[PDB]
Amino acid sequence: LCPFGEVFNATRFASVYAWNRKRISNCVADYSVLYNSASFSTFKCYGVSPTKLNDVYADSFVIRGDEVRQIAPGQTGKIADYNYKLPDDFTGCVIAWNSNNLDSKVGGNYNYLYRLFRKSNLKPFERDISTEIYQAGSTPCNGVEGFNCYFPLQSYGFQPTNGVGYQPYRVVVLSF
Amino acid sequence: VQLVQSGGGLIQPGGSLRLSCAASGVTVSSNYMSWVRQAPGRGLEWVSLIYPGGSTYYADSVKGRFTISRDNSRNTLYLQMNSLRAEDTAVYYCARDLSEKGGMDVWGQGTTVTVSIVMTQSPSSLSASVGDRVTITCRASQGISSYLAWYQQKPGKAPKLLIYAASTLQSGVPSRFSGSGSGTDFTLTISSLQPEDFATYYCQQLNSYPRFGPGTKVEI
Known part of the structure; x- marks a missing residue:
């Protein structure tokens, strides 16, 4: 009785720089709950058919609206390149639902972060939770914040008033 | 016997988006497949039928922009949505139409599309x-x-x-x-x-x- 619903219904999700992989093993669960809660703004399956499921990794993170399109084979952008990369030959399913009511708050929610500065693109399924001052300039930073010496992370600032593409979405990626 | 449908997301007006809907117990080319959407706040609204023999129909408010089709090889109904606008924001279901002999008895799960005789x-x-x-x-x-x-x-x-x-x-x-x-x-x-x-x-x-x-x- 696999805990798919512990991933989905977690009362808290994480950041895309620090996404949570939960390995499911020693179990058998239907993927019924995916295709039975009609309340998902996106559900795509690559390399497999979503009917042929029932006859191993759950990754959960929060991003904003018009970049869930990046959590897919072959897409690129600030997320696919520096936060959560998903390979071009993915065999799994991407599940995403608006979380405005839960990850937004008045005056802005700056608890969810993403990686703005990274010198090279991530490998597929790679993770980088490094907080080293990114050198933008020609002068060494010596780990000190300032000009050309930037904390490579950036807050989302999820506010309920945001346009629909700038609203917080919860994403679950089941890789097979 | 399910209908699992897939794809959706956001898209700025003018863009295009291709819903799918894979079936298990039913044969897509042998049934009347149809799409219904519920706009937020509104009720259910028929979008488009496809007959087993190939004929296609659409509601006035989508004709010319949407194209229902199906692939017999992988048994899947599609809804091809171009020239999208804000009024096309709704939850989009695919349903098997038995018509006068059984209604729409077998429905898929929703896929929220978010555009930014009575x-x-x-x-x-x-x-x-x-x-x-x-x-x-x-x-x-x-x-x-x-x-x-x-x-x-x-x-x-x-x-x-x-x-x-x-x-x-x-x-x-x-x-x-x-x-x-x-x-x-x-x-x-x-x-x-x-x-x-x-x-x-x-x-x-x-x-x-x-x-x-x-x-x-x-x-x-």
């Missing part, structure tokens, strides 16, 4: 206590004989057939659900509201293109 129903909203008896009515402008169905849709979940052919109960439905009428006036009775029965109920004509009524909501 049927009548009365009451529009009603509160009833658990174990009450509830009768909602549906009215037709032209006489449609007994060709009319009923569906419950609970908030968030896909619709569900109850009665088709005015009086025939869909297999797997509690006996408390019952319905009668012919001509232009139709009723749905719940003999004893059990807490699960709290939702909104539509009628639909089963002759024409699927045409749903406004909807009557039950609540406490």
Whole structure:
């Protein structure tokens, strides 16, 4: 009785720089709950058919609206390149639902972060939770914040008033 | 026997988006497949049918922009959506149309798309206590004989057939659900509201293109 619903219904999700992989093993669960809660703004399956499921990794993170399109084979952008990369030959399913009511708050929610500065693109399924001052300039930073010496992370600032593409979405990626 | 449908997301107006809908127990090219959307705040709205023989139809507000199709090789119905606008924001279901012989009995789960003869129903909203008896009515402008169905849709979940052919109960439905009428006036009775029965109920004509009524909501 696999805990798919512990991933989905977690009362808290994480950041895309620090996404949570939960390995499911020693179990058998239907993927019924995916295709039975009609309340998902996106559900795509690559390399497999979503009917042929029932006859191993759950990754959960929060991003904003018009970049869930990046959590897919072959897409690129600030997320696919520096936060959560998903390979071009993915065999799994991407599940995403608006979380405005839960990850937004008045005056802005700056608890969810993403990686703005990274010198090279991530490998597929790679993770980088490094907080080293990114050198933008020609002068060494010596780990000190300032000009050309930037904390490579950036807050989302999820506010309920945001346009629909700038609203917080919860994403679950089941890789097979 | 499911319909799992896939793809959706956001898109700025003008863009295009291709919904899919894979079936398991049914053969897509052998049935009447159809798309229904529920706009936020509105009720159910038929989008487009595809006949088993290949004919295609659409509602006025989507004709020329949308293209229903199917791939017999992987048994999947598609909805091709171009020239999208804000009014195309709705939850998009795919459903098997048995028509006058069974309604839309097999529905997919929703896929929220976010763009940045009149049927009548009365009451529009009603509160009833658990174990009450509830009768909602549906009215037709032209006489449609007994060709009319009923569906419950609970908030968030896909619709569900109850009665088709005015009086025939869909297999797997509690006996408390019952319905009668012919001509232009139709009723749905719940003999004893059990807490699960709290939702909104539509009628639909089963002759024409699927045409749903406004909807009557039950609540406490």
